[PDB]
Structures are given as structure tokens and as C-alpha cells.
Design a protein around this ligand. Structure first.
Ligand SMILES: Nc1ncnc2c1ncn2[C@@H]1O[C@H](COP(=O)(O)OP(=O)(O)O)[C@@H](O)[C@H]1O
Ligand SMILES: Nc1ncnc2c1ncn2[C@@H]1O[C@H](COP(=O)(O)OP(=O)(O)O)[C@@H](O)[C@H]1O
Ligand SMILES: O=C1Nc2ccccc2/C1=C1/Nc2ccccc2C1=O
Ligand code: MOO
Ligand code: MOO
Ligand SMILES: [Mg+2]
Ligand SMILES: [Mg+2]
Lengths: 637, 304, 157, 624
């Protein structure tokens, strides 16, 4: 025989599971009750569309909250559709039965209504804080009833006589002896602001201040539900100020929507200035928030947007996203990746279109160039688009910052590269010895004078098909002529002995001594190999607190010393070396020149006191301050 | 037996000009032959790409160790003493020609011998043999000798270098010492380091290297001496002569701070001869004082 | 107002990993990143050879010289050469090996290395010294014989 | 009248809720099934304790996993207690009904058994990946039945007559089309390793490669044993299995707590620091949390502070309240208490390790950076952490000493600890600030890491004695009355020269005074008591993400100090008194200021001016 059975439930254990293991925060009971009230008001309002007689028992739709520390109770009154006796029994008394779901299903297809609630277990979160719950309901087709229980396996229903509720429901919670924190103004205000900010009906609060004072608590409205064309910039400013508590309005706004298998609407704001604690990593970022049917779900958590776009304040609202049983998380978390892709694409479009208005792009860049450069350092997919948003000072430009596109459009015909220099300040780089020849020849040099520029240019290899070339690295190539090549070759042939001697004296400080092709009025300079940290990058990396000092040897570059053949000092040194290569003066001059070049090229001396002592010795001099076994020892064995 | 009939069937076609004198050398595995070369294109343009007897630079060649190019060996096989002949070869024999003459003339960017790289063809080879000696008679050059015999050869090189040094010649003594040092060092690669044989080999190189450093110091090449001396001291750190030479070089290149320290190390390690170290210290001090006086004269009020 | 010193950092990642080797450079134990860099598992590294099997043929002399220096002084400076992967490919690596002593005697070798790209590897190779000081002079050794038995370090065990 | 009803439930929607909105990950069905099998094995083992005859259908207690790609099914076979027809109808056919809870409650107090599972809904996670579930079971005192369902609101039970099984249960899942990744070797191995690694019975996977069988959970949970019954060899083997490290551990702490909150913890210290210790792109999974040997969550920054991220270990509990998905805790405030205990025990372990010398040297070389970060961040444990610091010193030579050793070696006339911060040990050792301090015989601590500069901001005093920087203005030293008389005479003598120098260097320094810390150098630059030092300025300037637009307001003001007993200064005074407007004194003062700036840890705004000065001097020296 093959028997057949039907599944069953254990009501006591099911209630225990619902109360204890479903919700982690005890504050979401208010969110659940306000969602229920909003659903009821939606139901009554929709029904009254085709039968205005349904509002004869009151015409205003609202929600009220009434603390009562004397009785230690919290009341939530709404003027919604209300519940009949049969509806009371079938909906409140049944676990996993939802009246809202059935109402939506019976609804004629193609109607404007979006009601929260599809599970049928939200009402029992009220027992997170309440020892006993009383519900007083009143429908248009029935009398007024009272529903009472303690979640102890049974509930009672009785006809209720008393103050008449014209229409709707009243929920009274008898808070526990340890849950009295929810009878205070601050706590209720904060909970409602966090969870039920954008409910479609006023949520008034009644408090004893004697007289009964009232506050709406949800004055602002979700403008993102309206068409973008209908909204004026003043309304956007008002919404942004209400959202972020900023005394001044946004700088730019983006309002888009996505349709298809996954649909949502978004509102993205660009602040007018950077917050004082933008990059601090102990903040629990909540710049962008996710809503489902105007109810808060979760904060960003760097899931809806990359970390370098954390300065953007906005909202993302969806109609149909599968939620967890506790509506503070998404099932199928991989949807967040699609949402993030769309948001990033639209943010880049916003930045690109804001670049046309030069005056406002100036402010935006001055505020968030750090974020743009960090994104270049981090993001590989959007690197090309981000590179077009960068602005730099150049040698040819004045006090203005130019783009790389203008640099490319202003290049020479022979030029094949973009020349840049990184240093500690604009003054330092502009007067450096690396740029004398490049600037004399009429080429343009890009100045990058911030530490973040190092990280930025590590990943930027070429722009618009043209490579980026550092003037402080070995192997600089410039367009040249035959006569210049002949002069360079003759100079190189004439200075071989001096180069060899200088390498001998600087035994291990340098890796190579060559003839420069980038100097005009300086005697020498120090450049670094093609692969490895530049002087500026090495300086920045050695100053980092959380840096592994064991790995420095792997990343450093070798120093090359370059000398200027057309300088008096170099010619004198060459003549002296030809005269007598072991001259003391030559050795002291070589060491002093190397130290000075090291200091001026961005490096730090191993012992500055040696350089100081050499200078002091020069100053004092200027001031005029002050056997037979021998032949055996060094002959053979 | 019959090699002339073998060359034609191998592909090459050669014609003799002047028969040589004497019998045919054995030409066994390993043999030294001296001869002249003059190579010219066969028919493409007819010019000469490389020539030796045209200017008089003999091209030595030992027969048959590896010698990547097997055409030269086969060519000189069928030539006796004083036999002059000319001939060409197929592209197959001389396909890899650029890997031969790239440096055999420079070590003593070619545009002629690089012509074959883009258009191979047969090439003429004008040969002239003068002498051919089997192993045993000629003094084998060090690079071609076997390990077991170079081991016993090193002392003769050492003694020749010493004899040349004492006579009053240095550059040649330096060359001999260099050859002995390289010969010994190549052997050490044959043996595991740290084992008794490696240290035994290392024991007999330090004297030769000290002589090499002495000659280098005499020829006024100080910076080179420092590296070898540092290499010796790092491993040993108990050589009086090594410290002495290193300090002398440091003094010669004005490295007074280290020269004094090395002399003090010598004194603490070899207290026997204080007068010599003190004399060196005094000479260094006198030179330093002289240069200091000259510098004081040189600046003498540059500010005001 | 003004902010006090904090420890905001960029947190740059690197691909440096360590390996444990026997005296003959036999890999016995590798870091997790090493597995990714050189396609292998725990067993293969041990049962694949003696390290010198991994070295590219052109790099063998360079690595042998560095091994000699490491034994002489206990650790070899940075060296760039090629390594043999399971897929037979070659990857340039910048490695620095260190000798550990248990009791006045060598015990094993710890190697810290960084993978390189073909461009950086070729650059390092180009600049690599073509010869060592006490070479056999220009005796046409690579022409006539060109056959050396290589150092005794490489001979198994 | 007052009616009274009983709560009801609607089964179809309840099943939909359990299957669609409870679990965010589909891979936990294997975890749930293996937990059920483990509970069954525990039940049979406990039952056989008093009646050995119970184990007459079999003696081995094992779990089996058998993929079948041809039929597209996954089978979990166990040799547990099994369940009868009544149990099949009640336990497996009722939602929120737990047989494990009833079995545990039936037991007397102090039982030697702790079983997972008390909710009664975990079995239905099988429908996350399966279309239909067949359960073959066999109890000791009962026949063998087959239970079948498709989550369609009904199930059938029939007496099975197939290949017999001696005792236990056999669950067969008919996988969906889109969920066939779980029939692969790698996916099953990964899931079992992640979730059911430390189950107390062997788990074996059967694959075609001749059906090879491979055990999956080889390592036992050693933390259940007593600390003193474990040798260091098995500690190390467990550590190597856990962290996958080819090396052994350096130290281990194994402790327990009792009371309302009870847990056991194993904490390990690696021998070497990973090269990605602070790499931001890493999950905080250094410490794992377990409940009854089943993995719950990773550390996630709430179980341990961020400066202890190098600690590897395990925390296991028996009575932590979980949520329905068993992937987190309800009332997450317990993590704070656990973190407090873990921090206390880690500090205790560090203190104990400090007794050994070579081991502590290894540990410090590896994690001094983390210790200093903890000092900067953590205020409660700052005093304890300050005794773990080791520094190089002017009198320690090549080794490193502690602050207590410095204080025990102090002179009765010394009230403060003297330190200097700089780029490297060579730079600070030969600095001009420590000349006199070392001449008088005092001791100076060398700090050569940027983290040290961060650290000294919080470590204002140690052992009641304050720390003083030798690079700041107003360095105080014990003196004699003759020294003060000489200082006053020197100030009176050099007032005019100082006045002239302050005139020449307008708005480059804020004062020119007479130094009391120089011996052989002519001058040095120090900073005011308020503001950044040169080292702190260097560190702050290099922060890429810092806003330095207003950095000028945090920078300290620099005072130039002159050496009365230096020949250059005496000649400068003579030249100034002779003719104060000479060019020689102007050029010399500018050069001296620039050189002192360079040597004192600052950087010139335009190095090219200094370079051109030096080049002009060289040219004049060469006669050009
Ligand atoms: N204030 C109210 N007015 C009218 N009906 C209500 C009210 N509160 C609850 N209900 C009914 O009781 C049921 C309780 O379900 P609940 O646990 O809130 O889950 P859901 O919100 O998904 O229905 C709802 O289906 C709803 O129809
Ligand atoms: N493999 C098995 N062997 C024996 N009994 C089982 C097995 N799997 C499930 N059961 C029984 O069926 C019930 C199903 O409940 P379950 O979903 O496992 O939740 P819980 O584990 O919390 O009891 C359990 O109480 C258990 O007694
Ligand atoms: O650095 C390595 N990493 C490796 C990983 C696998 C196998 C070998 C090596 C390395 C060697 N470094 C060397 C240095 C000198 C001589 C030989 C060798 C090596 O075989
Ligand atoms: O109001 Mo519900 O029970 O979260 O769908
Ligand atoms: O096996 Mo359960 O139903 O997750 O406690
Ligand atoms: Mg609800
Ligand atoms: Mg279970």
C-alpha cells in the first residue's frame, strides 16, 4: 500500500520561531505596524475611487502614534479599511496568511497600487516588545470588535463597546517591563525616521508637553516617484537638504530609471563640497540607501557603488526585489552587482556631462579630484573614461588647469609622447633641472604635484594612443636632427674617461654614469631606471606607516648619474682627470657634486651630516679659521 | 684512405693549386693547425668579404673539439703542410656563417658577412696551410687543456709569472697570474663548495691572487685591487698581506679613514713590523697635510 | 575643525610570496600565492626534481653563480631569471634566497620572490653582466669547445 | 459573550516561505543534511552506551556522499539511528517539529551529548536545489520505509522492498536542471570544507575515476580536549591543517570561559607575518566562530580589534542563540563580551612570551608594527601594550631594550626619557641634537618608523616618567650653577648677533637663540612645543588621502639655535660687530640656515637655490 498525507504545522513552535529567530533588531516592530497601516489606507483609498460613499465614516487618511507612560502602552491608530470579524479571524489568527496578497490577486490587472506585505507573519513582530496586544477594528460592513492575545496559543474575539472608531484599526501594545525605551520622543522619532520616512500618508505623533502636541515626522515626500521632467531644481535642492541636512544645495543631480527583468529608479546627488571625514574607514558608510516600495531595506556597504564614489548621496527604489523574511536583506545578492554597474555607468555619464559647464566643473574637480584619481588607481573597466576627466597644470598653461585632450590637440608633429614630472610642489618641479631642455625646445610638460598623482600615473600608461613619459626616468627620447646626433656622439666619445673615473669613485652609489640629453644650465642630475619607484614615489612609500619594510629592495630603482658636457665645471673636471686621474680635488669635487645632485633630485641622504660637514669645512677654509724584511713583505708570497 | 673522393660526394667541389710538402697529418680528435684564410663571394658579386693574408693576421684553428662549423675542419683535413688551394662550398655547409666571423676579427655590425643572412649562396674559400702540429709538441693554450693536466700545469704558470715579475716586467706577469687564477677557478666549479677539495683549491689561489693584486698596485690601478682584497678578507679575515694591500690602496686613493683602520688591524694582527706601518701612516699624513695646505690657499676668502 | 594625525592609507597589494627549499633547492612547501604563480600542487613540487630542473637553460650559469655566493655568504642578492611552470611556460621572477643554520650547519633555504612581466624580465636580462672577472679570456672557448661540464652544484646531490 | 479561537497556520504559504525567503545561500542544504546525519549518529551512539546490542545492524558510524551525474541525483547515506513510520509522519512531515529537541529533553541532567538542530525546518532546505526528495529509512525495531514528496503539499510513505540497509537513513535528491554544479567533485569538497569540516564522524565521497572513496574531514577538533593533555606536535599539526601554512606556529593560547556565556578558544601566533597583512582587499576571516562544531561566521571586525589581525584561531560555543538561517547571531551584543575576553587573553599570551628571549625577538621582528598600531588605537590596554615595546638605544649597541630597562638604568638627576624620531638609525645616531645629551652620559631612544611617530602621540609618559623629544624647543637638562652663569654670559655676549640674524632671516624662523644641546655643529633647527615636528611633517605631507589644504595651520614654527663655542659663530660675531652690513655675513648666514634646515629633517621649498649656491662656491674654488 502507498499512503498519502498532508503537511502539518506545530503552532507553539512556529510562534516561538517567529518571535525569537526571525528578526535581529527589536525596533522593526514599528516598521511592520506602519507598513500594515499604510496597506490598509491604500486599500480604503483605492476602494473609494469607484464608490465615494465608502468615506462617509471620515474623509481623511492618516496614522497616529500615542505613547502613554502612565499605562506603559503604545497605540497606533489608522483610519484604513478596517477588519471584519471573519477577516480578523482569518488574517490575524492565521500564520502565513496575508490579506494584502489576496486583495492584490483579486485586483483587476493594470491598476495603480503598490502595497507592502506578502508573507503574513509581520504582525507577530509586535511581540518582540509587547507582552499583550489588543486590536480594535471597525469595518464599513460590520460592527466594532476587539482582538486580544499574548501569543500563547490562543486569542479571544469579542464585540467592543466604547469610544467609537469611525473606521479603521487601533493597535495597543502593552510593552514589557524592560522595553520602556519606546515611550520616549527621541527613540520613536529616530525609529520612524530610519525606517518609515517615506510612507505615503502623514504619521502624526501625540505627546504631553499641559496640552497634546502634534508632529508629522514625515513632512518630506519621495520626489523620485515623479517624472524627471516635471521637477525643478528648487524641489531637488529641498529634497537634498532634507535628506542630507546640508545648509546649501547640491551641485548636480541625476534622475534615471531602468526597465526590464530588473527595474528600479535612482536619484544621485553630487555634494557641493567634500565632507571633512570622507575617507575615514570607521564610518559604516550609508551614502546610498536601498528602498523597496518606499520602505528602507539596507545601506550601501560598498555593494551598490565602488569605494571611490563614496561621496555621492542618493536613493535607489525598486518595486519587485525578492526580500528575506526579515526585510533587511536581499535574496539573490548577485543583483547588487547589476545595480552597481548601472549606477557607475550613470555616474560617469553625469560627470562627463557636467564637464561642459566649465565653471561648475572647476568646483567639482577642486572637491573630488582625489576620488577620481583613486578610481583610476582602482578601477580597470572605467579607466579610459576616468582619464578624460583629469585636469593638470602644464608648463605652457598659466594659472589654469588643462585637460589631456587639449595637450594632445596642442602637440607638435614630431612629438609622440606626453611629458610629465611628479614632485612635491609646483614651484619645485617648474624650476627643476629635468625640464630645462624639454621646455627650451618648446615642448609642453604636465605638472603633477600631489602624492595621489603617483598612484594615478602608475596605472595610466597611455592616453589617446600616446604614451606618458616621465622626465625623471632614464631613457628620455626627444626628436632630434642629424647634426644634434653627431654632436651627441662626439661628446659621448670625448667624455668616456671621465665617466669611467666617476663610476670608479662612486663605487656603489650609482649604477651608471652617462652623458645627459636633458640639461641646459645644470652640471648633473640623477634619474631612475625604467622599472622601479621614482624618487618621488620612493619618498612617498617610505613615509607610509602600514608598509612592509622587508619588500623595499624588490621595488626600488637603480640610480643613474647624468652629466652636462656643456658646463664649465664638467669641462674642468675632464681636463683635471686627463692631467692626473688620482688627484684629490677631483675626488672631493665628484663626491660633492653627487651629493648636491642627490639632494636636488628628490632623494634623501643616508647621512645628511656628511654633507653638512663638507659644507662647514669649505666655510672654515674660506674664512681661514684653520727594515730588511720590508722588501720581503711585498715582493712574492 | 681516400678523402679526395669523399669530398666530392659530400657536396663540395675543390681544386688544388700547389701540392704541399711532406706527409698527411693524422688530424685526430684534438690537433692544432695554423693557416691563412681569404674568403670571397663565388659569383654573386665576386668581392672579398674577409681576408687574413691580405694584411697578415694568422687565423689559428685546432681541429675537432666541437667547433660548431664543421666545414672548416673538413676543408683543412685534406691539406698538408704548405699546400695552397681554393674552392667553394654549398649553402648547407655555410648556412650559419654569421655565427663565426661576427667577432673572430673584431675581437683582436658587419655589413659584408651579414649579406648571407638575407641571401645565402655558395662562397669561395682560399686556404693556405703553413704548419700543423699534433698535441704534445706545441704548448697547449690554457682554455683547451684538460682538467687533469691543467691541475699540474698551474704551478709552471705561477713560476713563470714570478720569474717575469722579478726581472722587471709586470704586464706579462699580470697576464700569467690572470691565466693561472682563471685556470684554478674553473676547476673549483668541478667540485662541491664547502667540501675539503673546494677549500683545498681555494688554499692555492690566494697566493696567486695576492701576487695579482701586488702587480695591479704596482701598475697604479688601485680601485681594482680593492675589490679582490675585499673578496679575500671577507672569506678569511686573517690575511696580513691582504689587509696591508687593501690599506695601501685606500691610502693611494685618499681613503684615509679606512686606510688607517686597516693598518691598525695589521698592527694588531702582525705586531712584528711596526716601523713599516708607521712609515706608511707618516707618508699618508704628510700627503694629506700638503693637500690641506693647498686647499686652504685655494679658498682663502671666497665670500668677501 | 582641523583633524589630528590619522592612519589613512591606500593599502597597495603585492604578489610577493615565500617558498621553502632543501639544500639542493628542492621545493618542499610553498606559499598559497606561489601555487597560483607556478601551476603546481603540494605533491608535484616535491616529486618533480631538484630545483635546477626549473631553471631556464640560459639562466643556469647565473643561478649557479648566485648559489655559490649564497653558500659562501649565506644569502644571495636579488636575481632575475626564468622558472619552469607545469604548463611548460616560463615566468620571470625576482628572487632572494637565504640560508638558515640549525647548529653551525645549513638546514634549509627560504626564498622570497616576486613574479615579473616579460618586459621587465627582458629589460633585466639585457643589462645582465655578460661575463665574470676571472673568465678564461677570449680563447674562442664558445667557438672551439663550447662544452663545459657546468658547476658541481648542479650535479644531483 | 467572549469567544476564544486557536492559532492556525496555512501550510502552502508556510512551505513557500521556508523554501523562498529563509536561506540566502543554496549551498547550505548539504550543511543541514550533514547536521541531521551527525545528530542521528550521536543518537545511536548514545543509545548503544547502555545496550550494546543496539549496534547489531552495524558497528561503524559514518556518512557517505554519492553523486550520480547519469541520473542527476545526490545521495547522503548515514548509519544513524534511523526513524520509524510514526517518526516519518511526525518529525519529517510536520513543520517546526524537532525530534532532536525532544530526544535531548527526554535525557536526564548532565548528559554527555550535544546535538545540533532545534528548529524543525532545516530539512526543507533540500528543496532549494532539488525537485523531489526521496528518503529511505530503517529503524532497529521497525521495517524499512520510503518517504517521498515534491513540496507540493502532500507526501507519501510506502514500505520499501529494495536493496536492504541495516540501519539508518538514505536521502536522495533529484537535482534541478540549473543546480547540477553540486554533482562535481570540487564544489562538494569546497562546501563540505567550508561548513562541515569538524563534524565528529567520517565523511566520505564516492566518485568514478572503480569507485574511489575519499575521506573529507581528516582533522579533529582538538580544542575540545584539555590544554595540558596536548603536545606541541599535535598543536602544530592542527595549526598547519587550519591555516594551510608550510611552517609551524610560534605560540598557542588555549583557554575557556564559564558562566552564562561559555565558549572555548584556540589562538595561534604565526612565525612570519603574511605579506598581505594590511592588504585592504581581504576578508576578516582570521578567526572563525563555531557553535557545536558547525561554522557560523567569520571574524568581521567584531570579534577582535583590527590591530590583532595577525592572530589565527577558533572560537567555539555551545549555547549561542542563532537566527533561522544559522548564519548569524541574534542579540549580536555578545560579540563585544567575546572580543573583550579574546583581547585580554592575547595580551596575556604576549606577556608570557616576553619571558623567552629569542622567541620574543622573532615575534617582535614580525609584529611590532601591530603592537604600535594597537598603542595608537586602543586606550584601555595602552599601559599593558607599552611594556611590550622594544627600541634601539644609544647605549644598547646592536640589541634592543625595553622602557623598563631604560628606567632602571636612569640617573637620579634624570626626570625624563629622551628620544629622537627620524628616517633611519644612522641619521638619528649621528644627529646634531643628541651630541651634548650623549656627552653628558644620558641615554636616548632611537625611533625610526613612521608608526613610531604616530605612537609617541599617545605615549605621553611611562612608569610615571615623561618622554621628551630632543628635537623640540626648550630641552631641559640637569645643570650646575657654573653652567647657568656661563649660559647667561653667552646670551649677553651673543644678543647682538642673534638680533642681526633674526633680521636677515625675516619670516623664515621665529627666533634665534643660544643652543644648549650642540657640541661640534654650529647650528640646528628645532620646532616649537606646539605643532608637528620635522618627522611628523614629513609623514603627514606624504598621505595621499589627507586634506592638506589647511596644513599650514598645523605646522610648527622653527627656531634657529646657535653654538656659542663654535669657531664659525665666533668669527660671525666678530664680522657682525666690525661691519654689520657686509655681504660676507649675509651670504654665510643664508648658507648656514639652509644647511641646518637640510640636516634637521626639513626639506627646502626650492632646492635649486641651494644647489646654485654650492655650484658658485665650487666655481670660485676652481678659479673659473
Ligand atoms: N491596520 C490594519 N487594517 C486592516 N487590515 C490589517 C491591519 N493590520 C493588519 N491587517 C491584516 O492582517 C494581516 C496581517 O498580515 P501581516 O503579518 O501584516 O503580513 P502582511 O503585511 O504581508 O499581510 C494582513 O494581511 C492585513 O490584511
Ligand atoms: N538522517 C536522519 N536520520 C534520522 N532522523 C532524521 C534524519 N534527518 C532528519 N531526521 C529527523 O527529522 C526531523 C527533521 O527536523 P530538521 O529539519 O532536521 O530540524 P532539526 O534538525 O532542528 O530537528 C529531525 O527532528 C530529526 O529527528
Ligand atoms: O628562487 C627560486 N624559486 C624557485 C622555485 C622553484 C624551484 C627553484 C627556485 C628558485 C631557485 N633559486 C636559485 C638560486 C640559485 C640556484 C638555483 C636556484 C633555484 O632553483
Ligand atoms: O507585513 Mo509582512 O508579514 O513582512 O509581508
Ligand atoms: O536542523 Mo534546524 O531546523 O536548522 O535546527
Ligand atoms: Mg505587514
Ligand atoms: Mg537539521
Amino acid at each position: 500500500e502507498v499512503e498519502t498525507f498532508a503537511f502539518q504545522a506545530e503552532i507553539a513552535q512556529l510562534m516561538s520561531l517567529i518571535i525569537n529567530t526571525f528578526y535581529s533588531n527589536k525596533e522593526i516592530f514599528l516598521r511592520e505596524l506602519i507598513s500594515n497601516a499604510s496597506d490598509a489606507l491604500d486599500k480604503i483609498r483605492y476602494e473609494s475611487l469607484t464608490d465615494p460613499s465608502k468615506l462617509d465614516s471620515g474623509k481623511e487618511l492618516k496614522i497616529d502614534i500615542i505613547p502613554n507612560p502612565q499605562e506603559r502602552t503604545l497605540t497606533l491608530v489608522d483610519t484604513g479599511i478596517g477588519m471584519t470579524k471573519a477577516d480578523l479571524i482569518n488574517n490575524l489568527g492565521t500564520i502565513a496568511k496575508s490579506g494584502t496578497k489576496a486583495f492584490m490577486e483579486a485586483l483587476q490587472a493594470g491598476a495603480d497600487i503598490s502595497m507592502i506585505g506578502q508573507f503574513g507573519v509581520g504582525f507577530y513582530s509586535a511581540y518582540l516588545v509587547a507582552e499583550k496586544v489588543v486590536v480594535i477594528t471597525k469595518h464599513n460592513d460590520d460592527e466594532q470588535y476587539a482582538w486580544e492575545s499574548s501569543a500563547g496559543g490562543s486569542f479571544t474575539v469579542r464585540a467592543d463597546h466604547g469610544e467609537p472608531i469611525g473606521r479603521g484599526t487601533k493597535v495597543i501594545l502593552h510593552l514589557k517591563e524592560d522595553q520602556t525605551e519606546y515611550l520616549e520622543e527621541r527613540r520613536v522619532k529616530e525609529v520612524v525616521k530610519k525606517h518609515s520616512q517615506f510612507i505615503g500618508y502623514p504619521i502624526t505623533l501625540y505627546l504631553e508637553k499641559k496640552y497634546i502636541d502634534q508632529e508629522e515626522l514625515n513632512k518630506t515626500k519621495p520626489i523620485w516617484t515623479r517624472n524627471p521632467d516635471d521637477i525643478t531644481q528648487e524641489e531637488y535642492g529641498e529634497f537634498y537638504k532634507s535628506l542630507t541636512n546640508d545648509w546649501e544645495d547640491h551641485l548636480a543631480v541625476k534622475h534615471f530609471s531602468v526597465e526590464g527583468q530588473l527595474e528600479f529608479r535612482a536619484l544621485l546627488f553630487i555634494p557641493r563640497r567634500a565632507p571633512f571625514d570622507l575617507f575615514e574607514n570607521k564610518k559604516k558608510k550609508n551614502n546610498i540607501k536601498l528602498y523597496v516600495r518606499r520602505v528602507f531595506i539596507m545601506d550601501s556597504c560598498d555593494e551598490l557603488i565602488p569605494e571611490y564614489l563614496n561621496f555621492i548621496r542618493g536613493v535607489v527604489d525598486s518595486e519587485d526585489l525578492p526580500l528575506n523574511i526579515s526585510r533587511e536583506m536581499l535574496q539573490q545578492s548577485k543583483i547588487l552587482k547589476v545595480i552597481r554597474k548601472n549606477i557607475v555607468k550613470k555616474c560617469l555619464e553625469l560627470f562627463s556631462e557636467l564637464a561642459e559647464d566649465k565653471e561648475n566643473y572647476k568646483k567639482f574637480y577642486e572637491a573630488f579630484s582625489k576620488n577620481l584619481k583613486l578610481g583610476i588607481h582602482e578601477d580597470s573597466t572605467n579607466r579610459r573614461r576616468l582619464s578624460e576627466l583629469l585636469r593638470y597644470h602644464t608648463s605652457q598653461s598659466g594659472d589654469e588647469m588643462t585637460s589631456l585632450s587639449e595637450y594632445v590637440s596642442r602637440m607638435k608633429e614630431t612629438q609622440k609622447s606626453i611629458y610629465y614630472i611628479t614632485g612635491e610642489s609646483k614651484e619645485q618641479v617648474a624650476n627643476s633641472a629635468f625640464v630645462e631642455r624639454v621646455r627650451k625646445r618648446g615642448f609642453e610638460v604636465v605638472y603633477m604635484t600631489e602624492p595621489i598623482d603617483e598612484y594615478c600615473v602608475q596605472q595610466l600608461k597611455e592616453f589617446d594612443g600616446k604614451s606618458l613619459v616621465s622626465v625623471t626616468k632614464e631613457g628620455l627620447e626627444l626628436p632630434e636632427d642629424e647634426e644634434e646626433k653627431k654632436k651627441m656622439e662626439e661628446s659621448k666619445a670625448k667624455f668616456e674617461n671621465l665617466c669611467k673615473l666617476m663610476k670608479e669613485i662612486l663605487d656603489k652609489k650609482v649604477e651608471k654614469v652617462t652623458i645627459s640629453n636633458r640639461l641646459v644650465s645644470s652640471p648633473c642630475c640623477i634619474v631612475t631606471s625604467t622599472y622601479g619607484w621614482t624618487a618621488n614615489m620612493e619618498r612617498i612609500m617610505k613615509a607610509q606607516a602600514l608598509r612592509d619594510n622587508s619588500t623595499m629592495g624588490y621595488m626600488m630603482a637603480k640610480k643613474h648619474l647624468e652629466i652636462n658636457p656643456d658646463h664649465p665645471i664638467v669641462e674642468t673636471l675632464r681636463q683635471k682627470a686627463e692631467a692626473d686621474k688620482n688627484d684629490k680635488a677631483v675626488k672631493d669635487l665628484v663626491v660633492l657634486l653627487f651629493e648636491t645632485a642627490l639632494l636636488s633630485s628628490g632623494f634623501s641622504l643616508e647621512d645628511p651630516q656628511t654633507h653638512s660637514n663638507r659644507i662647514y669645512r669649505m666655510i672654515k677654509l674660506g674664512l681661514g679659521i684653520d727594515d730588511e724584511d720590508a722588501s720581503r713583505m711585498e715582493e712574492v708570497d | 684512405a681516400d678523402i679526395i673522393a669523399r669530398l666530392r660526394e659530400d657536396g663540395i667541389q675543390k681544386r688544388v693549386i700547389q701540392e704541399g710538402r711532406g706527409e698527411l697529418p693524422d688530424f685526430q680528435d684534438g690537433t692544432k693547425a695554423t693557416f691563412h684564410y681569404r674568403t670571397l663571394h663565388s659569383d654573386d658579386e665576386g668581392t672579398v668579404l674577409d681576408d687574413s693574408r691580405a694584411r697578415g693576421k694568422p687565423m689559428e684553428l685546432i681541429i675537432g673539439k666541437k667547433f660548431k662549423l664543421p666545414v672548416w675542419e673538413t676543408i683543412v683535413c685534406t691539406m698538408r703542410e704548405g699546400e695552397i688551394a681554393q674552392f667553394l662550398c654549398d649553402i648547407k655547409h655555410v648556412v650559419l656563417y654569421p655565427l663565426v666571423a661576427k667577432s673572430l676579427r673584431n675581437i683582436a655590425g658587419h655589413a659584408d658577412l651579414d649579406a648571407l643572412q638575407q641571401n645565402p649562396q655558395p662562397l669561395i674559400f682560399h686556404m693556405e696551410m703553413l704548419k700543423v702540429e699534433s698535441p704534445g709538441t706545441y704548448q697547449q693554450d690554457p682554455w683547451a687543456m684538460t682538467d687533469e693536466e691543467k691541475a699540474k700545469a698551474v704551478p709552471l704558470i705561477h713560476q713563470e709569472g714570478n720569474r717575469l715579475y722579478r726581472e722587471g716586467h709586470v704586464k706579462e706577469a699580470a697576464a700569467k697570474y690572470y691565466d693561472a687564477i682563471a685556470c684554478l677557478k674553473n676547476l673549483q666549479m668541478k667540485e662541491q663548495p664547502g667540501s675539503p677539495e673546494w677549500i683545498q683549491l681555494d688554499q692555492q689561489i690566494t697566493p696567486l691572487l695576492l701576487n695579482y693584486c701586488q702587480c695591479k698596485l704596482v701598475v697604479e690601478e688601485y680601485y681594482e685591487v680593492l675589490d679582490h682584497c675585499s673578496s679575500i678578507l671577507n672569506k678569511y679575515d686573517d690575511n696580513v698581506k691582504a689587509y696591508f694591500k687593501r690599506g695601501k690602496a685606500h691610502a693611494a686613493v685618499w681613503n684615509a679613514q679606512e686606510a688607517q683602520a686597516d693598518f691598525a688591524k695589521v698592527l694588531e694582527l702582525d705586531p712584528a713590523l711596526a716601523p713599516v706601518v708607521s712609515r706608511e701612516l707618516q707618508a699618508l699624513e704628510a700627503r694629506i697635510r700638503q693637500k690641506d695646505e693647498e686647499d686652504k690657499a685655494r679658498f682663502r676668502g671666497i665670500f668677501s | 575643525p582641523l583633524q589630528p594625525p590619522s592612519i589613512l592609507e591606500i593599502r597597495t597589494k603585492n604578489f610577493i610570496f615565500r617558498t621553502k627549499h632543501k639544500l639542493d633547492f628542492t621545493p618542499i612547501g610553498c606559499d598559497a600565492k606561489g601555487r597560483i604563480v607556478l601551476g603546481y600542487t603540494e605533491a608535484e613540487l616535491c616529486t618533480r626534481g631538484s630545483g635546477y630542473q626549473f631553471i631556464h637553460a640560459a639562466d643556469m650559469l647565473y643561478c649557479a653563480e648566485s648559489h655559490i655566493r649564497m653558500i659562501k655568504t649565506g644569502e644571495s642578492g636579488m636575481i632575475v631569471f626564468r622558472l619552469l611552470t607545469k604548463n611548460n611556460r616560463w615566468t620571470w621572477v625576482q628572487s632572494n634566497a637565504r640560508l638558515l643554520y640549525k647548529n653551525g650547519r645549513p638546514d634549509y633555504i627560504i626564498v622570497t620572490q616576486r613574479p615579473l612581466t616579460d618586459e621587465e624580465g627582458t629589460e633585466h636580462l639585457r643589462k645582465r653582466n655578460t661575463k665574470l672577472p676571472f673568465m678564461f679570456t677570449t680563447g674562442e672557448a664558445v667557438l672551439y669547445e663550447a662544452t663545459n661540464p657546468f658547476p658541481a652544484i648542479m650535479d644531483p646531490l
